[PDB]
Amino acid sequence: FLGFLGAAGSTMGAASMTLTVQARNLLLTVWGIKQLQARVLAVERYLRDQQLLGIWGCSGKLICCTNVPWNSSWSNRNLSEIWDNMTWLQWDKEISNYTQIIYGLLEESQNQQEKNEQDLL
Partner 1 sequence: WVTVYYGVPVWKDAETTLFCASDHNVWATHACVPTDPNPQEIHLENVTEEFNMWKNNMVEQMHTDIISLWDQSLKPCVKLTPLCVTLQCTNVTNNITDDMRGELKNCSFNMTTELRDKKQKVYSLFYRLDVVQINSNKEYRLINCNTSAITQACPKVSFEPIPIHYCAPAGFAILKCKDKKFNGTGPCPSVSTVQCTHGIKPVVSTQLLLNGSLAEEEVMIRSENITNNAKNILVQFNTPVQINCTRPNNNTRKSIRIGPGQAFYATGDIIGDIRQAHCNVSKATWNETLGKVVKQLRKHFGNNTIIRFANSSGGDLEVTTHSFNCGGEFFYCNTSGLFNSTWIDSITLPCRIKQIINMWQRIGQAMYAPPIQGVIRCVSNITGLILTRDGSTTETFRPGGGDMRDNWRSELYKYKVVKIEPLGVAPTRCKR
Ligand X SMILES: *[C@@H]1O[C@H](CO)[C@@H](O)[C@H](O)[C@H]1NC(C)=O
Contacting residues toward partner 1, per CB under 8 A: 2-10, 12, 15-16, 18-23, 25-28, 30-32, 34-35, 37-39, 41-42, 45-46, 49, 52-53, 56-58, 61-70, 75, 79, 82-83, 87-89, 91-92, 95, 99, 102, 105-106, 118-119, 121
DSSP-derived 3-state class of residue 95: coil
DSSP state of 25: T
100/83 Cα distance (integer angstroms): 22
Give yes or no for residue 79 binding a second copy (CB under 8 A).
no
N-terminal to C-terminal alpha carbon distance within the chain: 46
Number of amino acids touching a second copy (CB under 8 A): 34
**Measuring CA to CA, how many Å separate 64 from each of 10, 14, 16, 59, 69?**
21, 17, 12, 9, 14
Structural Rg of the chain based on CA atoms: 18
- Beta-carbon contacts of 35 under 8 Å, excluding residues fewer than 6 positions away, are none
User: What is the closest distance, in whole angstroms, from the C-beta atom of residue 59 to partner 1 in the complex?
Assistant: 11
**Considering beta carbons, is residue 9 or 104 the nearer one to ligand X?**
9
* DSSP letter, residue 69: P
> Which residue lies nearer to a second copy by CB, 55 or 102?
55
Q: Which residues bind a second copy (CB under 8 A)?
A: 17, 20, 23-24, 27, 29-30, 32-33, 36-37, 39-40, 43-44, 46-48, 51, 54-55, 57, 59-63, 65, 107, 111, 114-115, 118, 121
